[PDB]
Design a protein around this ligand. Sequence first.
Ligand code: PLC
Lengths: 61, 171
Amino acid sequence: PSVGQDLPPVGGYEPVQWRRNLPARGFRPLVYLAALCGICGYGFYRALGGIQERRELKREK
Amino acid sequence: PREAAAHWVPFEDKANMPDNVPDVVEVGATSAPLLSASYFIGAKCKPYNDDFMLCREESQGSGAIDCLKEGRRVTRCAVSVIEDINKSCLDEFRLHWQCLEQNNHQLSGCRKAEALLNKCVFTKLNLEKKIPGLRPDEEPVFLKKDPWIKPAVDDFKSVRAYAEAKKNGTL
Ligand SMILES: CCCCCCCCCCCC(=O)OC[C@H](COP(=O)(O)OCC[N+](C)(C)C)OC(=O)CCCCCCCCCCC
């Protein structure tokens, strides 16, 4: 006979996940390129404005 | 002229000026008050400064000893303007040069004190601050509102005095 043996459940276990699960995340690459362009352009706007004002301060001094 | 190199000692000369040379007062302001007053000195003493420099050029090598009387005029005019500032606008002038002493002598760090100083000097001395060489399109930076470059800490006494002047209506 068989009494007290480790055995599986009558209905079985729920299925486990074994297939590859690496979902794609993130905006499309051109969105990141556009954001980089916008950040750099705004930074250049600020930096060149600062350089020009610094030159006028140099004139005053 | 180059700065001194490896080993040097400073030495003072104890002689007096030759008695033929007429004596003159010397400017007693230090670097910060002088920088604060520089534009007013320029405005008032331009003809004498120009004459002194022209004399020096025309002397063609003997300028120190040939322009002493022109230099005497230059120094007297500078002393006169600083005396006038000390008589009519001392509080604001002191605000401005103490601010400069806190801000590495950068005029951009002291615009609030400078506004009061300029208004005082214009109303009681009829001197105007002006930057030479700009076109009418170009805006002088000291008149600019909302500048890119601002001081790290707006000067305390200057902020208070500026707000008070805005209440009073002087500025
Ligand atoms: C190859 C580069 C081509 C880029 C063309 C972009 C022109 C867009 C028009 C906006 C300019 C503007 O209108 O802003 C003017 C600004 C700031 O000057 P301001 O003080 O505000 O103007 C007042 C003029 N004053 C001072 C005489 C009174 O000037 C700039 O420098 C900012 C230009 C934007 C940054 C572009 C850099 C591009 C990235 C370079 C990476 C190698």
